[PDB]
Symmetry: C2
Subunit: 49 residues, 2 copies
């Protein structure tokens, strides 16, 4: 589970942290405040290119 | 009372909905679906001149 914040003015989506049932040791931790991008296949991915 | 619809995809604000406690003959009712802008003085206004 990861939380996305949508800017009301810009319309962009950013990662605003995440919560997991287990500890997860922050292994799957994505960077907070990074712009959210749509992959070519249509998934959600932080990679620009 | 003027009702504005906000498109959450990009943040654009349009005019959609007019309410009047009197008949008002729709004197102050702009056509719905017109993109609203901000005047020089910061007011909320429809013309782009």
């Amino acid at each position: 589970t990861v939380s996305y914040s949508v800017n009301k003015d810009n319309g962009s989506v950013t990662v605003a942290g995440y919560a997991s049932a287990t500890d997860t040791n922050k292994d799957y931790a994505p960077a907070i405040g990074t712009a959210v991008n749509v992959n070519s296949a249509g998934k959600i991915t932080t990679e620009t290119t």
